[PDB]
């Protein structure tokens, strides 16, 4: 009767409230631990580099950086490759399959959550070109399937709420998380189920915002709705006209082509790894070698970079002065030392002329292949943030080129085109458009920017699908 | 019009702001804000407070263009951004000992450069004088963060920042004295060796799988 | 047969693009004509009042105001009562019925669109306590069913795109429009259909924003995504913590209780109108009398208001000075002369000392009953904006009391509670909660406020359903 | 050292000193003209002197004085003086040539003086509004017409302010007329307003009652 239905229904809302609360807490734990561990690692590296800069022996600083990257990834890859291989990657395809209806072994076990959270912490601290936002979706699903109603029909509904809560916590987009659970579900419309999914999604982003606020002491300020916060786009500089619509469509073509190349190289690389690097010992060695190479390539770019500009208010978290004048700090070092989320935010909101095209171009080309190489490693890590960083990097270069070509026109704001470039790369790579589109508006907090973003994403998807077919036919 | 006793607070504030604005300009190219006319700012804020303490209603918010308000806000904003409080003691009556110590060190560092001008001599005569000045400036930076609990180390008193930037520009841009030890060959050898590891690993795994 | 599918699908996207374009154009036509006609009407009334203020004869100004209100509503009610009775109301229940599956006659005929657009223009210009945003949903549905695929299933999908485009144009919430079409549809998930709904909704809000900018002269600032634009909520004063969450829950109870009284009063009033005012002639007379009373009740409040404060820059368009010092406009006059959308914006964003509690309280009490009395009229008009205005009015009063009771505490910002009060009244009146909340986050462009908005809206619905059950039982 | 970093270049030292006393004069004249507001009619020569001096210093001393350091005192001070001029809005009521007050402003100030001096000798406040009422009426008509001239000749925005000295002149007159003199115009239209309002409010009562009574039988 109604008494039995209401008793069950309130427990569903109670459980989905815990799913959102715990998903936000896990995101807080990941963000706090990564920030403290990466800060400790970069302070050691920066201190060692500064000691050897004038006395000599910078090769030891490179060795220390590579060893520190390898040591963290060694732990982060051993636990994934040897204990729970299911934790490898962002875990979204496993979650998509679970919501589809096919059960992959060891996806929603409590051991997977521990390894996924530990793996993503060590992988991000390990210096790999990865992002921690992607695995947060898998973490929410495991919390939902463990906290929860011991039957398949209810469990899938809870997992959808957990996955939605993970998306909301990762990007601060509670509506985008609900959309993500909706399309992956692709079932009959349930008003109550969609309601408790929304309740879990919004509880999740509030818990992340609230707990991080008390961590920063700034309780009277809630400015961290997600793991990555794009900032505020309420600027006359961040305004577009109808004449820029064809330009934005062109960026989608670039994002679709680059995304197809990103997937093409990663596809051939994946086939190589399946045939030859399938043994768990080899996967651990490969992940360690990638981490060592990532530090080596970063050091070489920093060492050979001759462009450095004076410290701003918050340009660098760890300003590295190397071979140039006192009071100035390496610009290329800031690209690698700063967190990828911080780099994306700075690219989105920066006055024109803040980035030298040469150092930004070199970083974009190197990071594009490092991110492509890093995906597929037997580590718990995502690809959304590297995709965002790659797109924002070349999107800013597109804005820089437009300003040069149009005589520093007002409408040619590099920051605006960085946002368009970030969407184009995300669109051309993940090929998920609806939930992605809602995420950008919620991240940017600008409805008017939805229309160019929607066009850019739509262009990237159709171009990427056509180009992927063409590349495979040529091969 | 106001009372004759109410026109004296405005007139006193008028010449007080006139002379403060005069010092702000004539102490701008070599920035000497917080050490030249720190009392003039104190005199202005005291004279404004005198009005706040029977003329506040008829002078402060008596009209839309609150000239007295906006001028005091501008002077306060300039004082805050210049961080002139950091230059003076907590009592804000004279320059702090650390600032005074830096200022004479800055004078001594500039005293080096004139002697060794008549650029090879400058770089190898009293380089430690520049080194100790930079050590103090970095020391005062971290002390400033730990004193007022500022989250980053960004902005000191503008007198100190300008004094060091003049020294740094002289030592690096005008003089070519910075000589960092660059081990390009060891860096290349180590970086090449590490970058050559994935080639070995991918080839060895490919060849090991072949022929089992 | 992929070629046939592609040709059919591209035509669906082409049609859905026209639905969004035409829905935005209709919103532009409604907004442009209403502001020009209401501007002409208020200039005539203001000029007449200012002429008789000193020489005497203000009763003639009251007669002119009542006659002008009656004349516009007489035309707006004759075309609805005598020609197309289906166009009466906001048309939301008719669209929900159509999307449900049961077809009501003449809902999606071209004549209905002409009557609906003309009726909403005349009713808003006629001074009725109504809003033009609500009927915009019905207008989009009729455009979709006329532009369009001559079969029932395709018609329902296209109409849902038009309804979604109506919500996006009305409120600048393209995602909220998609959500509104999904629940009112309540069918199996369709990835491509939800794409066309999202495409049409997103085009609609861009077309309205783009064309209005052309009309407003300046073009490099698309500052009007929808018919009603809340503004920007990025202020230190506009922030909250956990301690204010229970306060928001209490305000949700007030919104639900007031919303229940709003529905209960309108239910008994509707029962009277069906039994006794069912003739088309009586419906026209009733609408005319309400318009005359609305002008008269506005006049006596403006006449008897002793509260007038000087012009603090903008915030009006027709500053009426009555019986007080020169250079000061009457505060109560600005409440009625200003458009309800503009009044809502001013309530949301204003210094904590801008509204007299007595003046705002008297307006809220009168406007609450005027809006309740005006709902059942045989005119084309919505109730969303009046409910927002009522909620923002007493929400601001709640914030004013909090400042008094907490010694002008920084967390008791009246503007923040005006937004929360606006949601409480809107949620407790329409009881539509999942689509409504998404609109608020899109309207305010602040995901951090989604959580208090969610709790306030959820609280209002729960107490609203309980109270109407109790109130009906008592009767 | 080069005469750039540690010490001022003699060419730039004199230019900075010239801008120093020009800014000192403007700030002193700004304060002493704050109340009553005679800002834009007395400080216009000083403001032009400052902006001319800044232009002279900025196009051989632009790079060594303006952006030579973080705290650009010369830049921020000129920005503040410019901001004060714009918010005071003396651009509109200064002539296009900008050597003196426009004809409108001169015509307003002398009427404002005439209105005020008329108030002074009517005290020794019933006699003030009994006799000096047309003087206030024509001055207020001019100010209302001045707004419309600003909305058309300038065409900035509805509700845009004129120069603050003109606005303060009217606000002083209005405050004198309505607050201290307490000269208010009585209204005897309350009774006709109530009679018409009651009649209109009573119409829906008849309409609803008549409909109910008519439908009571057949
Ligand atoms: C700052 C932090 C977040 C860095 C992460 C380092 C450790 C806290 C992590 C890394 C590896 C983790 C371990 C990985 C695997 C296991 C085995 C697991 O035991 C089993 O039940 C499985 C045993 C098996 O089958 O081998 C219990 C958790 C534990 C100890 C984990 C505990 C947490 C560890 C030590
Ligand atoms: C063997 C395969 C698998 C990898 C080959 C890698 C090379 C293409 C890279 C690795 C190290 C790189 C070098 C690292 C550092 C330098 C020093 C750099 O010289 C400076 O700018 C020195 C002064 C300064 O520090 O600014 C010029 C580039 C160069 C030779 C780089 C050239 C390109 C090198 C040889
Ligand atoms: C290239 C720069 C600008 C960015 C830094 C990334 C590289 C250090 C990575 C990216 C992709 C990697 C490559 C991906 C795949 C291969 C193929 C692999 O096997 C073969 O070449 C033989 C295969 C066969 O015989 O079938 C050898 C390593 C290599 C070149 C990898 C070496 C390291 C690469 C070049
Ligand atoms: C400022 C105001 C007073 C201007 C008037 C605007 C509207 C009130 C007018 C303009 C166009 C008119 C429409 C023009 C054409 C028609 C078609 C007409 O249809 C018929 O010929 C059949 C009528 C029937 O038999 O029911 C019905 C009236 C209608 C909708 C008219 C209704 C009244 C409208 C909307
Ligand atoms: C018959 C039913 C259906 C309607 C009853 C309506 C009354 C309750 C309203 C209508 C007009 C109102 C009056 C409108 C104006 C005034 C003038 C007001 O006092 C003034 O003279 C202030 C005006 C001024 O000088 O600015 C005191 C309230 C009063 C009598 C109001 C009292 C309440 C009245 C009579
Ligand atoms: C606080 C007020 C001044 C705000 C403005 C709104 C009123 C002018 C409106 C709102 C509801 C209206 C009322 C709605 C219903 C009725 C009941 C109706 O009478 C009956 O139905 C009698 C039934 C019977 O005798 O059985 C007479 C009109 C009246 C009072 C209406 C008169 C006008 C009212 C009071
Ligand atoms: Cl995966
Ligand atoms: Cl990912
Ligand atoms: Cl990621
Ligand atoms: Cl309806
Ligand atoms: Cl509405
Ligand atoms: Cl409505």
Numbering used by the authors:
A (entry chain C), C (entry chain A): 115 to 262, 279 to 605
B (entry chain D): 79 to 131, 141 to 205, 217 to 310
D (entry chain B): 73 to 131, 141 to 205, 217 to 310
Paper quotes:
Lysosomes process cellular waste and coordinate responses to metabolic challenge. Central to lysosomal homeostasis are phosphoinositide lipids, key signaling molecules which establish organelle identity, regulate membrane dynamics and are tightly linked to the pathophysiology and therapy of lysosomal storage disorders, neurodegeneration, and cancer.
Conversely, ClC-7 activation is correlated with dissociation and increased disorder of the cytoplasmic domain along with novel transmembrane domain conformations, revealing a mechanistic link between specific lysosomal lipids, transporter regulation, and the enigmatic basis of the ClC-7 slow gate.
